[PDB]
Amino acid sequence: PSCVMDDFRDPQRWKECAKQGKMPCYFDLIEENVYLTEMQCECTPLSKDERAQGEIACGEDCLNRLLMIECSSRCPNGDYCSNRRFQRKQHADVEVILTEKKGWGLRAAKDLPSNTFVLEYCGEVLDHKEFKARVKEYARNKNIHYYFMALKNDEIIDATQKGNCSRFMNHSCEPNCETQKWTVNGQLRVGFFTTKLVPSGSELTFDYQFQRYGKEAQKCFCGSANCRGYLGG
C-alpha cells in the first residue's frame, strides 16, 4: 500500500483509509515548526531574458545559500529567487509507503538528482525539560516509533503528535539522504536533502546516528552490507 502527500490534507478520507491500513495512523499535520514554549545577498538581479534562457537566480554563489541561510521576500531576484525552498515548500515528489518491517516510509516518485531538497522535518520544538518529559510519556505509552530530531542546543523537534510526511523517513546505515540545517528569518529549521541520485521507486533514508533520539535501541532492518545492527539507545 502507498499514498500521495495530498491524501493527508483530507482528514475524513485519511481516517477511513487508516481504519483499513491503507494509510498511516492519524497525526496533526502542520507546515511550520510549533514552539511548545513560545540581510540581502549580493546576487545580480537576472534580466527577463536571462530568466527565459534558464539562468538560475541565487544559485551556487549566493551569499545566503553559501551560509545555508534562505533569502527573504526582499531578495534582489524577487520572485525568481531559487533560495527560498523551505518557505515556498518546494518539496520533492515522494510517496508514503508501507515497508516490510519498519512501519511506513518514504520513496521517490520520480528520479531525484543529488542534493535535492526533499522535505522539511517539522514538529513541536521542545527544550530539554519538555523533551525529557516526552521521552518518559512515550515510554509509558509503550510507543514503538520515535520522532525526536536534534535541532540546536536546547532545541529538539518532536514529530510524534504534530508534523508532516517527513516524519516517515526511515533510518539507514548506508543512506541516500542527509539533514541540513537552514536559517529562515533568523530561525533554524531542519530539512532532508538527497546525497546521490535517487532512482524513482527507491526508499528515501537518512542516518539517524547522533541526530535522532530513541530511548530503546532498536534492531536495524536497513539491509546494507555495512549495517551497524541498531539505531537509537
Ligand X SMILES: Nc1ncnc2c1ncn2[C@@H]1O[C@H](CSCC[C@H](N)C(=O)O)[C@@H](O)[C@H]1O
User: Using the rule CB under 6 A, which residue among 165, 171, 182, 206 binds ligand X?
Assistant: 171
Is residue 99 at the binding interface for Cl ion, with CB under 5 A as the rule? yes
Q: Which residues of the shown chain bind Zn ion in the complex (CB under 5 A)?
A: 41, 43, 58, 62, 71, 75, 77, 81, 83, 173, 220, 222, 227
* Pairwise CA distance, residues 115 & 214, whole Å: 27
Is residue 104 annotated as involved in ligand binding?
Answer: yes
User: Using the rule CB under 5 A, which residue among 150, 155, 211, 221 binds Cl ion?
Assistant: 221
Shortest distance in whole angstroms from residue 13 CB to Cl ion: 26
* Pairwise CA distance, residues 185 & 90, whole Å: 17
Is residue 102 at the binding interface for Cl ion, with CB under 5 A as the rule? yes
CB 217 within 8 A of CB 203: no
Identify which of 206, 192, 219, 24 has the alpha carbon closest to the alpha carbon of residue 104.
24
Give Cα 182 distance to the centre of its chain: 12
**153-174 per-residue burial string, b: 16 or more CB within 10 A, e: under 16:** eebbbbbbebbbbbbbbbbbbe
Residue closer to Zn ion by CB (options 1, 59) is 59
Q: Which does 204 bind (CB under 5 to 8 A by kind): Cl ion, ligand X, Zn ion, none?
A: none
Residue keyed to cell 502527500? 5
- Cβ within 8 Å of residue 93, ≥6 positions away: 108, 109, 110, 112
Identify which of 52, 41, 47 has the alpha carbon closest to the alpha carbon of residue 76.
41
SS3 content of the chain, % helix, strand, coil (to 5): 20, 30, 55
* Pairwise CA distance, residues 143 & 52, whole Å: 52
Residue count at the site for ligand X (CB under 6 A)?
19
Is residue 171 at the binding interface for Cl ion, with CB under 5 A as the rule? no
Which residues are 125's β-sheet partners? Answer: 35, 157
Is residue 17 annotated as involved in ligand binding?
Answer: no
Is residue 168 at the binding interface for ligand X, with CB under 6 A as the rule? yes
Residue closer to Cl ion by CB (options 31, 100) is 100
Is residue 162 at the binding interface for ligand X, with CB under 6 A as the rule? no
Shortest distance in whole angstroms from residue 227 CB to Zn ion: 3
Restricting to residues 88-147, name those near ligand X by CB under 6 A. 102-105, 144-147
Residue ranges at the known binding site: 41, 43, 58, 62, 71, 75, 81, 102-104, 145-147, 170-171, 173, 218, 220-222, 227
- Binding-site ranges for Cl ion (CB under 5 A): 99-102, 221
- Binding-site ranges for ligand X (CB under 6 A): 24, 102-105, 144-147, 167-168, 170-171, 214, 218, 220-222, 231
Residue ranges at the known binding site for S-adenosyl-L-methionine: 102-104, 145-147, 170-171, 218, 221
